[PDB]
């Protein structure tokens, strides 16, 4: 569905694959419906015996996917509302939700099952819905989140990375642009900038004896941390700026080069979230209409240069080389249609 978003945003879409995916969607949806809880929740098996309680994280993932499927195609609001109240019922007055564990595997998931991160993925997948940031539940969540950020932050360690960035995104949803950029800067604190782009890891090794092979209880969760960061810098109320989108593009380059040739990425989680972030990247930047750019580069040494970027040459790359030991190089662009420019 985030794939379809990719197609639509980037415009690379035929009705054929579109109908194929549609049939895929309806089928997977209903196969999911066979595994739910009559409360509204979801487990890996569920039905044909009430000898269980459903999970949460799953149901939140479900909620999100249901949201976007709504965003194009038809789906019952009843189910989101039921899963929502179910979440609430697994809410504490002051504490967060609880990992009501009924899963089978964890590489499916992109965190450490920390209750705060759990709640965090929940509430953020919530606020992607049309939601009043002043809602009761989410207000309570935000108290969790805020307290949680403080203890993460003032304490030298709070997982140092991912907890913190997901916090960043929920803060982004709020209106708390101040808190947003603050924890954003805390993410930039342990920054992992590269030759031509940036990223983060988890803390580059787990300190305890770990690993050996197969990513056992540790799927390395390396991208989705950046995906939500690619939301983090991005999304706000009015519209975005330079700096946000610069850092975005950096990690976007990290992202697409981190893309896997077999298809997708290392997993489904990272894949979904990257595609969401890239889609909205385009949904801002990629103006399918904006088609009349024009540019001049001017250096004080009158090393002139003139180009154009348009839909017909959309993926073009009009490189041009540069001799002046001192840079005096004044960029200038105009018109319509987004451009990413790179020099070294």
């Amino acid at each position: 569905i985030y794939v379809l978003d990719y197609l639509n945003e980037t415009q690379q879409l035929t009705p054929e694959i579109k109908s194929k995916a549609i049939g895929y969607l309806n089928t997977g949806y209903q196969r999911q419906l066979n595994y739910k809880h009559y409360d509204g929740s979801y487990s890996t098996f569920g039905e044909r015996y009430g000898r269980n309680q459903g999970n949460t994280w799953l149901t939140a993932f479900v909620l999100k996917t249901f949201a976007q499927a709504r965003a194009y195609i038809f789906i019952d609001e009843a189910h989101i509302t039921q899963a929502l109240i179910w979440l609430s019922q697994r809410q504490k007055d002051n504490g967060c939700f609880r990992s009501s564990g009924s899963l089978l595997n964890n590489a499916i998931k992109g965190g450490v099952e920390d209750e705060v991160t759990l709640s965090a993925y929940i509430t953020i997948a919530l606020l992607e819905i049309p939601l009043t940031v002043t809602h009761p539940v989410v207000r309570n969540a935000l108290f969790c989140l805020e307290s949680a950020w403080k203890t993460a932050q003032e304490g030298d360690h709070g997982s140092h990375v991912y907890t913190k960035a997901l916090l960043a995104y929920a803060f982004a949803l709020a209106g708390n642009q101040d808190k947003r950029k603050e924890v954003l800067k805390s993410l930039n604190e342990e920054a992992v900038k590269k030759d031509n782009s940036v990223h983060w890891e988890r803390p580059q090794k787990p300190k305890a004896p770990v690993g050996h092979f197969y990513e056992p209880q540790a799927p390395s969760a390396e991208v989705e941390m950046t995906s939500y960061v690619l939301l983090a810098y991005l999304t706000a109320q009015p519209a975005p700026t330079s700096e946000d989108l610069t850092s975005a593009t950096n990690i976007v380059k990290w992202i697409t080069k981190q893309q896997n040739a077999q298809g997708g990425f290392s997993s489904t989680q990272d894949t979904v979230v990257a595609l969401h972030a890239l889609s909205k990247y385009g949904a801002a930047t990629f103006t399918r209409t904006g088609k009349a750019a024009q540019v001049t580069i001017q250096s004080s040494g009158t090393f002139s240069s003139k180009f154009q970027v348009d839909n017909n040459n959309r993926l073009l790359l009009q490189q041009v080389s540069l001799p002046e030991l001192p840079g005096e190089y004044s960029m200038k662009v105009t018109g319509e249609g987004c451009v990413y420019l790179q020099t070294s």
Binding site: T81, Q89, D93, P136
Partner: protein
């Protein structure tokens, strides 16, 4: 001294279009506190905000109120917030909402008509209370037998809270069973069926008195027949009757008269009174496989050739069960620190007790087998010493664990019903508890009641204080109808026994009468136990009827009167009940008004919402018997305060130890001028501050039982019900 506490109560099945009330305890330190129960919809936004200053240890009950909403039904998040200067409490759950249906209904002029006749009926509006409301109606109409909507009246409003309509039928319009029906803004629909047909007026209801209930051990049977008439006079003539067993040994299918043994009796009505008969039940073989008795009695009224029948007491069950004791004041519960007693009854057969017949008590897992007998009423009182195990299941019988006559031949139909009842106990980690001795029987009204309770307090105020309160509530109708309080100055460290209360039965309380009451510990715990009372059909706005006496010789000047509230109104009915001898009316009683309702009672939360689950799991790796051997993990099953207050019908917010300390499941997994008969009165009256007396005028050559019905209303009191002035 003790811990700081709070508590706040409310139903789950809210309503709309009125206020609905809950209540609140606060108490214990830094009591300069406030609250607010925030009702805030989940999707989008809305808020029926309410706020309130918080005192201590008092029950003031605020009644917020409700608008309509977007959807008809929904959940609703409730969330409370409390703020003391040094304390607080915020707590939430879900609640049911419902853009309701007002329970509404009709009274008609007739339950029958003939050619060329004219409908006359009325209808009602209501709220939760029966204090009526003013609103507007989409439509009410009439429906032929064939779906042919036969007229319309539309877009009318209710200020009376009733309204009254009419219509003329043509010469030969539709035969069959007519139908008159409504619908509402939401779409709720409702009827008042009836028929149009032809008939000669009956001046006689054949009537009998013959066993409702013959049973197994019956060798013959009593039969009696009585012809009421005009004026209840005694009638002459001939009568014939058919006491009948049903559904015979034949196949019943298309060649076989399923009407099994009909014994036919020919009686000749003497000059006065009643024909009698004693009938033998041999030929019916009141035994294994022959079916319920049906009995048809038919009077050839002389000098008329007319006969009619009344299937009298059709539903006779000749039940294998006999000596059928019955529990009456059977408790649901018991405790490990109480002398309890189920006060128990016995009856047999028809519904009458025997005195002085011995029975056997069975005490199972309390090991109380014993013997007792019957009194004048078959009323008995076992009572049991209790230092026993959790789950108890009880009985006493007059025979033993088998059907003494030829049980398992598959062809025998005798039984002794045996006493059956299950009772549970409280959880109380204090080991302190309450339990009550209700007045468990038919509750009157126009009275009150004192209600004894038994208070057991292990430790009581452990440190606490010398004084402690008592707080009782009676909701009904999913509502709240009354409330109040009490307390006692607590003996240091013992278990002081007995005291009671009062409660009135003015009105406003449904056929339900739940009671609870709970006496808190400032430690942060409480106890309390339930109740239930079969209120009888009783009302707020009182009324009866009275009239200038019976007078034949149609003196037109003739009155009728009612007492009622001083600024009020009445809608009224008279009938020459000849046509309405031929057929009854339909369910015209105050109980009808009661049972029409949305959720007469409320026990158990509604559907969609589930629970209020907690996190506090307590599972040990193993239960840790330091001693004999490690006993493993498993659940329990007993009764709870949470459960008391959910079976109540409702919910509250605290942090006391209410719900049991239930545990997580296993995480690990794999001279006379004919004026109109068949109607006497269809008209309307207002109630001055001293009562009406209308002049409903005499009518000729129409000689019978004439029931006549009354309805009334007011903002301040409510609706109107009272019985028949037979101005014969």
């Amino acid at each position: 001294s003790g811990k700081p506490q709070y508590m706040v109560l409310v139903p789950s099945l809210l309503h709309t279009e009125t206020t609905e009330k809950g209540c609140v305890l606060l108490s214990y330190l830094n009591e300069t506190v406030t609250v607010s129960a925030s009702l805030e919809s989940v999707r989008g936004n809305r808020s029926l905000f309410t706020d309130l200053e918080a005192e201590n240890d008092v029950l003031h009950c605020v009644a917020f109120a409700v608008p309509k909403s977007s959807s008809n039904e929904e959940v609703m998040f409730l969330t409370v917030q409390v703020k003391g200067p040094t304390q607080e409490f915020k707590k939430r759950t879900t609640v049911m909402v419902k853009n309701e249906d007002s329970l509404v209904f009709v009274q008609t002029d007739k339950s029958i008509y003939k050619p060329g006749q004219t409908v006359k009926f009325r209808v009602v509006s209501m709220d939760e209370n029966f204090h009526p409301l003013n609103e507007l109606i989409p439509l009410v109409y009439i429906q032929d037998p064939k779906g042919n909507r036969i007229a319309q009246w539309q877009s009318f409003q209710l200020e009376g809270g009733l309204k009254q309509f009419s219509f003329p039928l043509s010469s030969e319009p539709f035969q069959g069973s007519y139908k008159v029906v409504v619908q509402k803004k939401s779409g709720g629909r409702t009827e008042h069926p009836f028929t149009v047909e032809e008939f000669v007026l009956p001046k006689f209801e054949v009537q009998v008195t013959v066993p409702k209930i013959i049973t197994i051990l019956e060798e013959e049977m009593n039969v009696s027949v009585c012809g009421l008439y005009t004026y209840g006079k005694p009638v002459p003539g001939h009568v014939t009757v058919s006491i009948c067993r049903k559904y015979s040994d034949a196949s019943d299918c298309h060649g076989e008269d399923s009407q099994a043994f009909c014994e036919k009796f020919s009686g000749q009505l003497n000059s006065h009174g009643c024909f009698y008969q004693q009938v033998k039940t041999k030929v019916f073989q009141l035994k294994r496989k022959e079916y319920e008795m049906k009995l048809h009695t038919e009077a050839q009224i002389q000098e008329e050739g007319t006969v009619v029948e009344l299937t009298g007491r059709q539903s006779s069950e000749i039940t294998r069960t006999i000596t059928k004791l019955s529990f009456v004041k059977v408790d649901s519960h018991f405790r490990q620190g109480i002398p309890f007693f189920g006060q128990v009854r016995l009856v047999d057969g028809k519904g009458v007790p025997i005195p002085n017949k011995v029975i056997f008590i069975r005490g199972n897992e309390a090991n109380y087998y014993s013997n007792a007998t019957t009194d004048e009423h078959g009323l008995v009182q076992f009572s049991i010493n209790t230092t026993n195990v959790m789950g108890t299941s009880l009985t006493v019988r007059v025979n033993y664990k088998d059907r003494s006559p030829c049980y398992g031949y598959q062809w025998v139909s005798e039984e002794h019903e045996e006493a059956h009842h299950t009772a549970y106990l409280v959880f109380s980690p204090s080991k302190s508890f309450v339990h009550l001795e209700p007045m468990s029987h038919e509750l009157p009204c126009g009275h009150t009641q004192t209600v004894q309770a038994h208070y057991i307090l292990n430790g009581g105020t452990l440190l606490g204080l010398k004084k402690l309160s008592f707080y009782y509530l009676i909701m009904a109708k999913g509502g709240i109808v009354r409330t109040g309080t009490h307390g006692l100055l607590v003996k240091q460290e013992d278990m002081k026994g007995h005291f009671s209360i009062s409660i009135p039965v003015k009105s406003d309380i449904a056929p339900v009468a739940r009671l609870l009451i709970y006496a808190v510990l400032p430690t942060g715990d409480v106890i309390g136990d339930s109740a239930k009372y079969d209120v009888e059909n009783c009302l707020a706005n009182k009324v009866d009827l009275s009239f200038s006496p019976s007078q034949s010789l149609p003196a037109s000047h003739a009155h009728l009167r009612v007492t009622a509230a001083p600024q009020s109104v009445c809608a009224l009915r008279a009938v020459d009940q000849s046509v309405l001898l031929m057929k009854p009316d339909a369910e015209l009683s105050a109980s009808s008004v009661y049972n029409l309702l949305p959720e007469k009672d409320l026990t158990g939360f509604p559907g969609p919402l589930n629970d209020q689950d907690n996190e506090d799991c307590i599972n040990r790796h193993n239960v840790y018997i330091n001693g004999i051997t490690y006993t493993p993990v498993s659940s329990t099953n007993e009764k709870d305060m949470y459960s008391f207050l959910e079976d109540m019908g409702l919910k509250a917010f605290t942090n006391s130890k209410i719900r049991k300390p239930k545990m997580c499941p296993q995480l690990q997994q794999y001279t006379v001028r004919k004026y109109f008969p068949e109607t006497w009165i269809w008209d309307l009256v207002v109630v001055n501050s001293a009562g009406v007396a209308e002049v409903g005028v005499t009518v000729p050559d129409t000689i019978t039982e004439w029931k006549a019905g009354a309805f009334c209303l007011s903002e301040d009191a409510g609706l109107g019900i009272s019985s028949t002035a037979s101005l014969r």
